[PDB]
Design a protein around this ligand. Structure first.
Ligand SMILES: [Cl-]
Ligand SMILES: [Cl-]
Length: 143
């Protein structure tokens, strides 16, 4: 029984995780990774020291294309220096741009609660898809 990928979790360092949930960062760049559904809700897991899901946002678009064109068009909305961007994309010619909308902060759901939802949860290297019963438990914890 395969997840539909309309619900996914992504990991960011806490300054960037907070920028997405506050609506300051509306673009997240990644390499060519397996993609979520276009209508997905993306729950934002902040890594140490926060180690918590701190909110979510939705996708208005997924863009893939040349690394230079993605920087020129969307880099201003991504909250990262051009240097951090060039360093992350060294070694590939193409990138993914996740364009986000409708960000929502929540009271943080810590890693102990997350392991109560999925026993071996650990922060994803890219995306992880939530199963429907996992999603029902996470929505139940939201404030
Ligand atoms: Cl990667
Ligand atoms: Cl670890």
């Amino acid at each position: 029984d395969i997840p539909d990928r309309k619900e996914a979790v992504i990991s960011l360092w806490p300054e960037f995780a907070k920028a997405i949930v506050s609506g300051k960062k509306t673009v997240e760049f990644r390499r060519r990774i397996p993609l979520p559904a276009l209508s997905a809700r993306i729950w934002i897991y902040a890594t140490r020291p926060v180690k918590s899901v701190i909110g979510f946002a939705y996708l208005e678009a997924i863009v893939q294309g040349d690394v230079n064109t993605l920087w020129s068009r969307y880099g201003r909305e991504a909250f990262l220096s051009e240097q951090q961007y060039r360093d992350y994309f060294e070694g590939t010619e193409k990138a993914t741009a996740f364009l986000l909308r409708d960000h929502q902060p929540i009271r943080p759901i810590n890693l102990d609660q997350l392991k109560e939802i999925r026993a071996n949860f650990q922060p994803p290297q890219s995306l992880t898809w939530l199963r429907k019963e996992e999603t029902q438990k996470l929505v139940s914890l939201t404030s």
